[PDB]
C-alpha cells in the first residue's frame, strides 16, 4: 500500500508523480503539509 496523500489535489498516494502543487488542509504548510 501507499501512504495517503496529505495534499487535497492529485492522486491518493503521497508524492504523486503527476502532481507539482500540494494544497494542504487548513493550518498546514510544506511539500507534504508537515508544518
Amino acid at each position: 500500500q501507499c501512504e495517503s496523500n496529505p495534499c487535497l489535489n492529485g492522486g491518493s498516494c503521497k508524492d504523486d508523480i503527476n502532481s507539482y502543487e500540494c494544497w494542504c488542509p487548513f493550518g498546514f504548510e510544506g511539500k507534504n503539509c508537515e508544518l
Binding site: 501507499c2 495517503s4 496529505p6 487535497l8 489535489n9 492522486g11 498516494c13 504523486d16 488542509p25 498546514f28
Partner: protein, 299 residues
Amino acid sequence: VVPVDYHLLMMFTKAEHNAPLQAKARVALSSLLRLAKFEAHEVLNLHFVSEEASREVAKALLRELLPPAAGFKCKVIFHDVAVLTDKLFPVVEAMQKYFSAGSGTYYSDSIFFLSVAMHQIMPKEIPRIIQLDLDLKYKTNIRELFEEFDNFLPGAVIGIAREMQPVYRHTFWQFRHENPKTRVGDPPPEGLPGFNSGVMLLNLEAMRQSPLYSHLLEPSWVQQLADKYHFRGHLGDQDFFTMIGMEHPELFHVLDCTWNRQLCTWWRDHGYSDVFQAYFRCEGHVKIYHGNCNTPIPE
C-alpha cells in the same frame, strides 16, 4: 435436522515472517471463537484467502484454537489468492485505476476488490457471507451479526458500517468545493461520511439479483461516477462501495457503528482536528473493535 451453514471470509496473505499480522489474526480468531455459540445443527465455515505459505501459517494458528470451547461444528476452507485474482480481474480491471495505490492497473491490487465481485467468485450455494478484517477483536457472539441480513430493505445488497474518520471529507474535496450544499463527505448523523470495509455483510443472492448493482460494475458506469465525483483512492473495495453509496445509498444497509468501532486517528493529525470528533464518535455497547492503521486495541 437440516444443517444450516454460516459463512465468514478473511484475507490472510503474506503472513510468513509477518509477526504483527499473525498476532492480529490471533487476537481476532481467538476472541471470535471464544465468544461464538451456534446451535447443534449449525456450522461455522471460515474461509481464508491465502497464498500457500500463509495457508500453512493459518493452519498452525487454527489447530491451537479449534475445536471451539462452545463445541459447535467449524469448517475451515482455503482459497488461493492467485486463482481469485484471475477470476476477479475481468470484472474489476476498470475500477483499479481509481481505487488502487496509485496508478494504474496491477494484478497485485486486484484482490483488494474481492468483495465487490464476491457473488461471482463464491459458489452459488453460498447465499450470504460476512467478510472480516483480521485486526478486529470480537466482544460478542458473531452469530448475532447474521440477524442484520434480515434488516436489509428491498434493493439493498450489502451491509456496511460508516467510516469513522474524515478520509472521505478529504477524498471528495473537489466535488464538495463544486457542490457547497452536498452531504457527500460530511459527518453523521446527517452527512454521508463513506464506509469502512472491515466488516461487510455480502448478500450474494441480492448482489447477483440486482440490476442496479450489476450495471455499476460495468467499466462505463465506474468511469462516469469516478469522473462526476473526481474520485481517486487507494483503499480498494472500501473506495468503490463508498463512491457508489454516494450515488445509490439504497444499495447499502448501514450497520450501527458498534459493529465496527474503528480506532484509527491518523486523519485527526493530518488536517482534520476541528471536525474529527464528529466523524469518530460512536456510542453504544461495542460488539467489534477494529484496530485499523495498526492501532493497538484496548482491553
